[PDB]
């Protein structure tokens, strides 16, 4: 049961199609410079059940 979806940053509200300027991590570019939700932040990939990376949440 993986609840996720594709969308723009919530705390930043800056839609991005191609990964440009923001590396896959805690989005901290411009509007995102302040806060981001977790590392993944509800991506779609995790929906594959660890098919690509693993899930929408990594340990510490
Ligand atoms: Zn962001």
Taking Cα atoms as reference points, which of 15, 44, 56 lies closest to residue 32?
Answer: 15
Euclidean distance between the first and the last CA atom of the chain, given in angstroms as a whole number:
22
* Alpha-carbon span 11 to 34, nearest angstrom: 8
CA 6 to chain centre: 9
Q: Is 35 a catalytic residue?
A: no
Taking Cα atoms as reference points, which of 37, 59, 47, 50 lies closest to residue 1?
Answer: 47
The count of domains in the chain is 1
| SS3 state at 53 | coil
Task: Show the tokens assigned to 5.
Answer: 């979806």
Q: Which domain holds residue 34?
A: 1-60
Distances 19 to 24, 49, 56, 60 between C-alpha atoms, Å = 8, 22, 18, 24
Instruction: Please give all residues whose CB falls under 5 A of ion ligand 1, grouped by chain where several chains appear.
Output: 9, 12, 27, 32
User: Got the DSSP string for 2-41?
Assistant: --------TTT----SS--S--SSS--SSGGGS--SSSS-
């Amino acid at each position: 049961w993986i609840a996720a979806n594709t969308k723009e940053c919530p705390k930043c509200h800056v839609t991005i199609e191609k990964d440009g300027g923001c590396n896959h991590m805690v989005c901290r570019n411009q509007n995102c410079k302040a806060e981001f939700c977790w590392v993944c932040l509800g991506p779609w990939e995790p929906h594959g059940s660890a098919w690509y990376n693993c899930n929408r949440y990594n340990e510490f």
